[PDB]
């Protein structure tokens, strides 16, 4: 009745227009207005744009005058989130909101955020489809000289984000924990995930780190086993 | 044709608006009969101007306009033709040559809250007077002592709009009174409502 | 700037009453326009608490409340619990097409089980060394709270350039985990006798050290 479906996210070079949609089902979005907002990674979320009686007003932030435009589709019940000539200044997982009614005072746009979530992720970077660099992580015997041993695999220079990372093809999840990536000095991305397993599992079990970069569809099954430093 | 005119939504009136957004409507071509508008609940003011309530229905007009909003209980006596008041100059007003009817009555059962229904607001400041039958949607900051603040709304510059509470545990003057304004015109087409 | 206010954080024990306030740099809360406070969920969808002074929302527990108290808009909640361990946003509507938010006020409840951070540092392997690149990872996990600042030193001199930090994230069993990255040259890496990674948690110092010659 109030379900929302969205599409059009992704990562591309800056300076080209992008089309993204907030399709609605269960009620007519053309009935009355709504809005939407973006959330920077870690940094607090801040407002972008609001719509009106579906024909009345096109209010925007002062930061986007002369560079943004909004559109709607009454027959197909969706609104277009037209995104022209991406700039690095805008990078969020922005999602659309809900405010329909017909009987109220209008000193503001009112009817703030009420239903959020299950949206699209958009990231802009000065990069292209660049192959990830995959490396194993084999600890020495000192840190494995205990009840539990830790194994991991490094992810480097992967674009566009994200890249599907998992362990043992999803069959083994015990002790598997993934750590978020950060911006490098050159503006690139890299991260690692470490799997903690008991010391009564080394050798017997096949520990494999699979990584797929969907835009290039490159397959790497990195074999992660402790170093055989018999010296 | 003795069909019912759509006066149900006018009276029972699901919800309302504020003073500046005085909720303009248009209805025409029905059958008018105010026997339904007769006394049914304790009414506090039915003193309406220039027309005999008895001969409302026999003599009929065209282009009827009927609106309503909320007002503080003390001022209900201040809305008159050629009557002073801050509402006259800074909110919705009425000209001197007024021909139409009007009703007032308190609404404490549904409009009261443990703290007060703060939805309803009003405008307190403007540049100058207002012409009759005008809706003001101004939002720019109002200046007090020159040197406009440019949206600061700080010292020596005040925001034009304000609001007040509706706590039920008050006196008579603080009770919210729902009021309906009736207006019309004579024009030059065959009549539209009466019967 | 129109940015209004946001307190950094506030402290309260569970099972009691907690207030929360966000004042105005303009100082005019009497505008009586819609004050709305919003939940936040780090990593998933937040929801609503109040839209308009104390106008309550749907599907809400009754313990929450809030109103314009004093000259500055605030909140007050009693019977606090671990349902929503996060910050919240108070929103006021000014500008006829202008919206103001805040950075959030990190409300942290104090009634929780507490542990010390777990630190593991792994020097780069030789296979990555042959790639003419070097990057060390010193991971920190199993800590609460996450208010930790990491500083890394080659030999005995901390270096600020070339260091990236990760904000801690919640674990499965309600605690925090983070890490950090440093990408310098292996030529620079092998020029130091030792490398040290330090993390402080509520003023408690934890130290980890690695030696390049061990991997040689
Ligand atoms: C308001 O509703 C009551 C109950 O349904 C009804 O008796 C009354 O006539 C209504 N007022 C009108 C129709 O003006």
Coordinates of N, CA and C in Angstrom, one line a residue, chain B:
Chain B
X1 N -36.7 20.5 -9.2 CA -35.6 20.0 -8.5 C -35.5 20.4 -7.1
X2 N -35.7 19.5 -6.2 CA -35.5 19.8 -4.7 C -34.4 18.9 -4.2
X3 N -33.3 18.7 -4.9 CA -32.2 17.9 -4.5 C -31.4 18.6 -3.4
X4 N -30.7 17.8 -2.6 CA -29.9 18.4 -1.5 C -28.7 19.2 -2.0
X5 N -28.5 20.4 -1.5 CA -27.2 21.1 -1.8 C -26.1 20.5 -0.9
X6 N -24.9 20.4 -1.5 CA -23.8 19.8 -0.7 C -23.3 20.7 0.5
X7 N -24.1 20.8 1.5 CA -23.8 21.6 2.7 C -23.3 20.7 3.8
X8 N -23.2 19.4 3.6 CA -22.8 18.5 4.7 C -21.3 18.8 5.0
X9 N -20.4 18.8 4.0 CA -19.0 19.0 4.3 C -18.7 20.4 4.8
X10 N -19.7 21.4 4.6 CA -19.5 22.7 5.1 C -19.6 22.7 6.6
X11 N -20.6 22.1 7.1 CA -20.9 22.1 8.6 C -20.1 21.1 9.4
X12 N -20.3 19.8 9.1 CA -19.6 18.8 9.9 C -18.1 19.0 9.6
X13 N -17.7 19.4 8.4 CA -16.4 20.0 8.2 C -15.3 19.2 8.7
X14 N -14.9 18.1 8.1 CA -13.9 17.1 8.5 C -12.8 17.8 9.2
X15 N -12.0 18.7 8.6 CA -11.0 19.4 9.2 C -10.9 20.8 8.6
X16 N -10.1 21.7 9.2 CA -10.1 23.1 8.9 C -8.7 23.6 8.5
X17 N -8.5 24.9 8.5 CA -7.2 25.5 8.1 C -7.0 26.7 9.1
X18 N -6.0 27.5 8.7 CA -5.6 28.6 9.6 C -6.3 29.9 9.0
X19 N -5.9 31.0 9.6 CA -6.6 32.3 9.3 C -6.2 32.8 7.9
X20 N -4.9 32.9 7.7 CA -4.4 33.4 6.4 C -4.8 32.5 5.2
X21 N -4.7 31.2 5.4 CA -5.2 30.3 4.4 C -6.7 30.0 4.7
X22 N -7.5 31.0 4.4 CA -8.9 31.0 4.8 C -9.8 30.2 3.8
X23 N -9.2 29.3 3.1 CA -9.9 28.1 2.5 C -11.0 28.5 1.5
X24 N -10.6 29.2 0.5 CA -11.6 29.6 -0.5 C -12.2 28.4 -1.3
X25 N -13.5 28.4 -1.4 CA -14.2 27.3 -2.1 C -15.2 27.9 -3.2
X26 N -15.7 27.1 -4.0 CA -16.7 27.4 -5.0 C -17.7 26.3 -5.2
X27 N -19.0 26.5 -4.9 CA -20.0 25.6 -5.3 C -21.2 26.4 -5.8
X28 N -21.9 25.8 -6.8 CA -23.1 26.5 -7.4 C -24.0 25.4 -8.0
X29 N -25.2 25.9 -8.4 CA -26.2 25.1 -9.1 C -26.6 23.9 -8.2
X30 N -27.3 24.2 -7.1 CA -27.9 23.2 -6.2 C -29.2 23.7 -5.8
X31 N -29.8 23.2 -4.7 CA -31.0 23.6 -4.1 C -30.8 24.0 -2.7
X32 N -31.0 25.3 -2.4 CA -30.6 25.9 -1.1 C -31.8 25.9 -0.2
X33 N -31.6 25.4 1.1 CA -32.7 25.5 2.1 C -32.0 25.4 3.4
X34 N -32.1 26.4 4.3 CA -31.3 26.5 5.5 C -32.0 26.0 6.7
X35 N -33.2 25.3 6.5 CA -33.8 24.7 7.7 C -32.8 23.7 8.4
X36 N -31.9 23.2 7.6 CA -30.8 22.4 8.2 C -29.9 23.2 9.0
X37 N -29.7 24.5 8.6 CA -28.8 25.4 9.4 C -29.5 26.0 10.6
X38 N -30.7 25.6 10.9 CA -31.4 26.1 12.1 C -30.7 25.7 13.4
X39 N -31.1 26.3 14.5 CA -30.5 26.0 15.8 C -30.6 24.5 16.1
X40 N -29.5 23.9 16.4 CA -29.4 22.5 16.8 C -28.5 22.2 18.0
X41 N -27.5 23.1 18.3 CA -26.6 23.0 19.4 C -26.6 24.3 20.0
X42 N -26.1 24.4 21.3 CA -25.9 25.7 21.9 C -25.0 26.6 21.1
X43 N -25.6 27.7 20.5 CA -24.9 28.6 19.7 C -24.6 29.9 20.4
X44 N -23.4 30.4 20.2 CA -23.0 31.6 20.9 C -23.1 32.9 20.1
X45 N -23.3 32.9 18.8 CA -23.4 34.1 18.0 C -24.0 33.7 16.7
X46 N -25.2 34.3 16.4 CA -25.9 34.3 15.1 C -26.4 35.7 14.9
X47 N -25.5 36.6 14.7 CA -25.8 38.0 14.4 C -25.2 38.5 13.1
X48 N -26.0 38.3 12.1 CA -25.4 38.4 10.7 C -26.2 39.5 9.9
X49 N -25.5 40.1 8.9 CA -25.5 41.5 8.6 C -26.3 41.8 7.4
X50 N -27.3 42.7 7.6 CA -28.0 43.3 6.4 C -29.1 42.5 5.8
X51 N -29.3 41.2 6.3 CA -30.2 40.3 5.7 C -31.1 39.7 6.7
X52 N -32.4 39.6 6.4 CA -33.3 38.9 7.3 C -33.1 37.4 7.2
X53 N -32.7 36.7 8.3 CA -32.5 35.2 8.2 C -33.8 34.5 7.7
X54 N -35.0 35.1 8.0 CA -36.2 34.4 7.5 C -36.3 34.4 6.0
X55 N -35.9 35.5 5.3 CA -36.1 35.6 3.9 C -34.8 35.3 3.2
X56 N -33.9 34.5 3.8 CA -32.8 34.0 3.0 C -33.2 33.1 1.9
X57 N -34.2 32.2 2.0 CA -34.4 31.2 1.0 C -35.4 31.7 0.0
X58 N -36.4 32.5 0.3 CA -37.4 32.9 -0.7 C -36.7 33.8 -1.8
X59 N -35.9 34.8 -1.4 CA -35.1 35.5 -2.4 C -33.7 34.9 -2.5
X60 N -33.4 34.5 -3.7 CA -32.1 33.8 -4.0 C -31.2 34.6 -4.9
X61 N -29.9 34.3 -4.9 CA -28.9 35.0 -5.5 C -28.0 34.1 -6.4
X62 N -26.9 34.5 -6.8 CA -25.9 33.7 -7.6 C -24.6 33.9 -6.9
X63 N -23.7 33.0 -7.3 CA -22.2 33.1 -6.9 C -22.1 33.2 -5.4
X64 N -22.5 32.1 -4.7 CA -22.4 32.1 -3.3 C -21.0 31.6 -2.8
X65 N -20.5 32.3 -1.8 CA -19.2 32.0 -1.3 C -19.3 31.8 0.2
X66 N -18.8 30.7 0.7 CA -18.9 30.3 2.1 C -17.6 29.7 2.6
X67 N -17.0 30.3 3.6 CA -15.7 29.9 4.1 C -15.7 29.8 5.6
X68 N -14.7 29.2 6.2 CA -14.6 29.0 7.6 C -13.1 28.9 8.0
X69 N -12.9 29.2 9.3 CA -11.6 29.0 9.9 C -11.7 29.2 11.4
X70 N -10.6 29.2 12.1 CA -10.6 29.2 13.6 C -10.1 30.5 14.1
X71 N -10.7 30.9 15.2 CA -10.4 32.3 15.8 C -10.4 32.1 17.3
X72 N -9.6 33.0 17.9 CA -9.6 33.1 19.4 C -10.9 33.6 19.9
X73 N -11.4 33.0 21.0 CA -12.7 33.3 21.4 C -13.0 34.7 21.8
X74 N -12.0 35.5 22.2 CA -12.2 36.8 22.7 C -12.5 37.8 21.5
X75 N -12.0 37.5 20.3 CA -12.0 38.5 19.2 C -13.3 38.3 18.4
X76 N -14.0 37.2 18.6 CA -15.2 36.8 17.7 C -16.1 38.0 17.5
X77 N -16.1 39.0 18.4 CA -17.0 40.2 18.3 C -16.3 41.2 17.5
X78 N -15.0 41.1 17.1 CA -14.3 42.1 16.4 C -14.4 42.1 14.9
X79 N -14.9 41.0 14.3 CA -15.1 41.0 12.9 C -16.4 41.7 12.5
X80 N -16.3 42.9 12.1 CA -17.4 43.7 11.7 C -17.0 44.6 10.5
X81 N -17.9 45.0 9.7 CA -17.6 46.0 8.7 C -17.2 47.3 9.3
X82 N -16.1 47.9 8.8 CA -15.6 49.1 9.3 C -15.1 49.0 10.8
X83 N -14.6 47.9 11.2 CA -14.2 47.6 12.5 C -12.7 47.4 12.6
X84 N -12.1 48.0 13.6 CA -10.6 48.0 13.8 C -10.2 46.6 14.3
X85 N -8.9 46.4 14.4 CA -8.3 45.2 14.9 C -7.1 44.8 14.1
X86 N -6.2 44.0 14.7 CA -5.0 43.6 14.0 C -5.3 42.6 12.9
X87 N -6.4 41.8 13.1 CA -6.8 40.9 12.0 C -7.2 41.7 10.8
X88 N -7.8 42.8 10.9 CA -8.3 43.6 9.8 C -7.1 44.1 8.9
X89 N -6.0 44.4 9.5 CA -4.9 45.0 8.8 C -3.8 43.9 8.4
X90 N -3.7 42.8 9.1 CA -2.7 41.8 8.9 C -3.1 40.4 8.6
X91 N -4.5 40.2 8.5 CA -5.0 38.9 8.1 C -6.2 39.1 7.2
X92 N -7.0 38.1 7.1 CA -8.2 38.1 6.2 C -9.2 39.1 6.8
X93 N -9.8 39.9 5.9 CA -10.6 41.0 6.3 C -11.9 41.0 5.4
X94 N -12.8 42.0 5.7 CA -14.0 42.1 5.0 C -14.3 43.6 4.8
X95 N -14.8 44.0 3.6 CA -15.0 45.4 3.3 C -16.3 45.9 4.0
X96 N -16.5 47.2 3.9 CA -17.6 47.8 4.6 C -18.9 47.4 4.1
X97 N -19.2 47.4 2.8 CA -20.4 47.1 2.2 C -20.6 45.6 2.1
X98 N -20.8 45.0 3.2 CA -20.9 43.5 3.4 C -22.4 43.1 3.4
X99 N -22.7 42.2 2.5 CA -24.0 41.5 2.5 C -23.8 40.0 2.5
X100 N -24.2 39.4 3.7 CA -24.0 38.0 3.8 C -24.3 37.6 5.3
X101 N -24.2 36.4 5.6 CA -24.5 35.9 6.9 C -23.3 35.3 7.6
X102 N -23.4 35.0 8.8 CA -22.2 34.5 9.6 C -22.7 33.8 10.9
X103 N -21.9 32.9 11.4 CA -22.2 32.1 12.5 C -21.0 31.8 13.3
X104 N -21.1 31.7 14.7 CA -20.0 31.4 15.6 C -20.4 30.5 16.7
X105 N -19.6 29.6 17.1 CA -19.8 28.6 18.2 C -18.5 28.0 18.6
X106 N -18.4 27.7 19.9 CA -17.2 27.1 20.5 C -17.0 25.6 20.1
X107 N -15.8 25.2 20.0 CA -15.4 23.8 19.7 C -14.4 23.4 20.6
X108 N -14.8 22.9 21.8 CA -13.8 22.4 22.8 C -13.7 20.9 22.9
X109 N -14.6 20.2 22.3 CA -14.6 18.7 22.5 C -13.5 18.1 21.7
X110 N -13.3 18.5 20.4 CA -12.3 17.9 19.5 C -11.1 18.7 19.3
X111 N -11.1 20.0 19.6 CA -10.0 20.9 19.3 C -9.1 21.1 20.6
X112 N -9.3 20.4 21.6 CA -8.5 20.5 22.8 C -7.5 19.3 23.0
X113 N -6.4 19.6 23.7 CA -5.4 18.6 23.8 C -4.7 18.8 25.2
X114 N -4.1 17.7 25.7 CA -3.4 17.8 27.0 C -2.3 18.9 27.0
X115 N -1.9 19.4 25.8 CA -1.0 20.5 25.7 C -1.5 21.6 24.9
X116 N -2.4 21.3 23.9 CA -2.9 22.3 23.0 C -2.6 22.1 21.5
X117 N -3.6 22.1 20.7 CA -3.4 21.8 19.3 C -2.7 23.0 18.6
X118 N -1.4 22.9 18.6 CA -0.6 24.0 18.1 C -0.5 24.1 16.5
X119 N -1.4 23.4 15.8 CA -1.3 23.4 14.4 C -1.7 24.8 13.9
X120 N -2.7 25.5 14.5 CA -3.2 26.7 13.9 C -2.3 27.9 14.3
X121 N -2.0 28.7 13.2 CA -1.1 29.8 13.4 C -1.8 31.1 12.8
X122 N -1.1 32.2 13.0 CA -1.6 33.5 12.5 C -0.5 34.4 12.1
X123 N -0.8 35.4 11.3 CA 0.2 36.4 10.9 C 0.1 37.7 11.8
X124 N 1.2 38.2 12.2 CA 1.3 39.3 13.2 C 1.8 40.6 12.6
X125 N 2.6 40.5 11.5 CA 3.3 41.7 11.0 C 3.2 41.7 9.5
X126 N 2.9 42.9 8.9 CA 3.0 43.2 7.5 C 3.5 44.6 7.3
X127 N 3.7 44.9 6.0 CA 4.1 46.3 5.7 C 3.0 47.3 5.9
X128 N 1.8 47.0 5.4 CA 0.7 48.0 5.5 C -0.6 47.3 5.5
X129 N -1.7 48.0 5.2 CA -3.0 47.4 5.2 C -3.2 46.4 4.1
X130 N -4.4 45.8 4.1 CA -4.8 44.8 3.1 C -6.1 45.2 2.4
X131 N -6.2 44.9 1.2 CA -7.5 45.0 0.5 C -8.4 43.8 0.8
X132 N -9.7 44.0 0.6 CA -10.6 42.9 1.0 C -10.4 41.7 0.1
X133 N -10.7 40.5 0.6 CA -10.6 39.3 -0.1 C -9.3 39.0 -0.8
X134 N -8.3 38.9 0.0 CA -6.9 38.6 -0.5 C -6.2 37.6 0.4
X135 N -5.4 36.7 -0.2 CA -4.7 35.7 0.5 C -3.2 36.1 0.4
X136 N -2.6 36.2 1.5 CA -1.2 36.6 1.6 C -0.3 35.4 1.9
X137 N 0.6 35.1 1.0 CA 1.5 34.0 1.1 C 2.9 34.4 1.3
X138 N 3.1 35.7 1.8 CA 4.4 36.2 2.0 C 5.2 35.4 3.1
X139 N 6.5 35.2 2.9 CA 7.3 34.5 3.8 C 8.6 35.2 4.1
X140 N 8.9 36.3 3.5 CA 10.1 37.0 3.7 C 10.1 37.6 5.1
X141 N 11.3 37.7 5.7 CA 11.5 38.3 7.0 C 11.0 39.7 7.1
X142 N 10.3 40.1 8.1 CA 9.7 41.4 8.3 C 10.7 42.2 9.1
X143 N 11.0 43.5 8.7 CA 12.0 44.3 9.3 C 11.3 45.2 10.3
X144 N 12.1 45.5 11.4 CA 11.6 46.4 12.5 C 12.3 47.7 12.5
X145 N 13.6 47.7 12.5 CA 14.4 49.0 12.7 C 15.3 49.3 11.5
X146 N 14.8 49.1 10.3 CA 15.6 49.2 9.1 C 16.7 48.1 9.1
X147 N 17.7 48.2 8.3 CA 18.8 47.2 8.2 C 18.3 45.8 8.2
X148 N 17.7 45.4 7.1 CA 17.1 44.0 7.0 C 18.1 42.9 7.3
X149 N 17.6 41.9 8.1 CA 18.5 40.9 8.6 C 18.8 39.8 7.6
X150 N 18.0 39.7 6.5 CA 18.2 38.8 5.4 C 18.1 37.3 6.0
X151 N 16.9 37.0 6.5 CA 16.6 35.7 7.0 C 17.1 35.4 8.4
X152 N 17.7 36.3 9.1 CA 18.2 36.0 10.4 C 17.1 35.9 11.4
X153 N 16.1 36.7 11.3 CA 14.9 36.8 12.2 C 15.4 37.0 13.6
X154 N 16.4 37.9 13.8 CA 17.0 38.1 15.1 C 16.6 39.4 15.8
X155 N 17.5 40.1 16.3 CA 17.2 41.4 17.0 C 16.9 42.4 15.9
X156 N 15.9 43.3 16.2 CA 15.4 44.3 15.4 C 14.8 43.8 14.1
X157 N 14.4 42.6 14.0 CA 13.7 42.0 12.8 C 13.0 40.8 13.3
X158 N 11.7 40.8 13.0 CA 10.8 39.8 13.5 C 10.1 39.0 12.4
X159 N 9.8 37.7 12.7 CA 9.2 36.9 11.7 C 7.7 37.2 11.7
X160 N 7.1 37.3 10.5 CA 5.7 37.8 10.4 C 4.6 36.9 11.0
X161 N 4.9 35.6 11.3 CA 3.9 34.7 11.7 C 4.1 34.2 13.1
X162 N 3.0 33.8 13.8 CA 3.0 33.4 15.1 C 1.9 32.4 15.3
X163 N 1.8 31.8 16.5 CA 0.7 30.8 16.9 C 0.5 30.8 18.4
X164 N -0.7 30.3 18.8 CA -1.1 30.3 20.2 C -1.7 29.0 20.5
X165 N -1.7 28.7 21.8 CA -2.2 27.4 22.3 C -3.7 27.3 22.4
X166 N -4.2 26.1 22.6 CA -5.6 25.9 22.8 C -5.9 24.9 23.9
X167 N -5.3 25.2 25.1 CA -5.4 24.4 26.3 C -6.9 24.4 26.8
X168 N -7.6 23.3 26.9 CA -9.0 23.3 27.4 C -9.1 23.9 28.7
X169 N -8.2 23.8 29.6 CA -8.3 24.2 31.0 C -8.1 25.7 31.1
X170 N -8.8 26.5 30.3 CA -8.7 28.0 30.3 C -10.1 28.6 30.6
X171 N -10.2 29.9 30.4 CA -11.4 30.6 30.6 C -12.3 30.5 29.3
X172 N -13.4 31.3 29.3 CA -14.2 31.4 28.2 C -13.5 32.0 27.0
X173 N -12.8 33.1 27.2 CA -12.2 33.8 26.1 C -11.1 33.0 25.3
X174 N -10.5 32.0 26.0 CA -9.5 31.2 25.3 C -10.1 30.0 24.6
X175 N -11.4 29.7 24.7 CA -12.0 28.6 24.0 C -12.0 28.8 22.5
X176 N -11.7 27.8 21.7 CA -11.7 28.0 20.3 C -13.1 28.0 19.7
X177 N -13.4 29.0 18.9 CA -14.7 29.1 18.4 C -14.6 28.9 16.8
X178 N -15.4 27.9 16.3 CA -15.4 27.7 14.9 C -16.4 28.7 14.2
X179 N -16.0 29.4 13.2 CA -16.7 30.4 12.6 C -16.8 30.2 11.1
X180 N -18.0 30.5 10.5 CA -18.2 30.3 9.1 C -18.7 31.6 8.5
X181 N -18.1 32.0 7.4 CA -18.4 33.3 6.7 C -19.2 33.0 5.5
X182 N -20.3 33.7 5.2 CA -21.2 33.6 4.1 C -21.1 34.8 3.2
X183 N -20.9 34.7 1.9 CA -20.9 35.9 1.0 C -21.4 35.4 -0.3
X184 N -21.7 36.4 -1.2 CA -22.4 36.1 -2.4 C -22.3 37.4 -3.3
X185 N -23.0 37.4 -4.4 CA -23.1 38.5 -5.3 C -24.4 38.3 -6.1
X186 N -24.8 39.4 -6.8 CA -26.1 39.4 -7.5 C -26.0 39.0 -9.0
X187 N -25.1 39.5 -9.7 CA -24.8 39.2 -11.1 C -26.0 39.3 -12.0
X188 N -25.9 38.6 -13.2 CA -26.9 38.8 -14.2 C -27.3 37.5 -14.9
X189 N -27.3 36.3 -14.3 CA -27.7 35.0 -14.8 C -28.9 34.5 -14.0
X190 N -29.7 33.6 -14.5 CA -30.8 33.0 -13.7 C -30.2 32.4 -12.4
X191 N -31.0 32.4 -11.4 CA -30.6 32.0 -10.0 C -30.1 30.6 -10.0
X192 N -29.3 30.3 -9.0 CA -28.5 29.1 -9.0 C -28.8 28.1 -7.9
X193 N -29.3 28.5 -6.7 CA -29.4 27.7 -5.6 C -30.9 27.5 -5.0
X194 N -31.4 28.6 -4.5 CA -32.7 28.6 -3.7 C -33.7 27.5 -3.9
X195 N -34.8 27.8 -4.4 CA -35.9 26.8 -4.6 C -37.2 27.1 -3.9

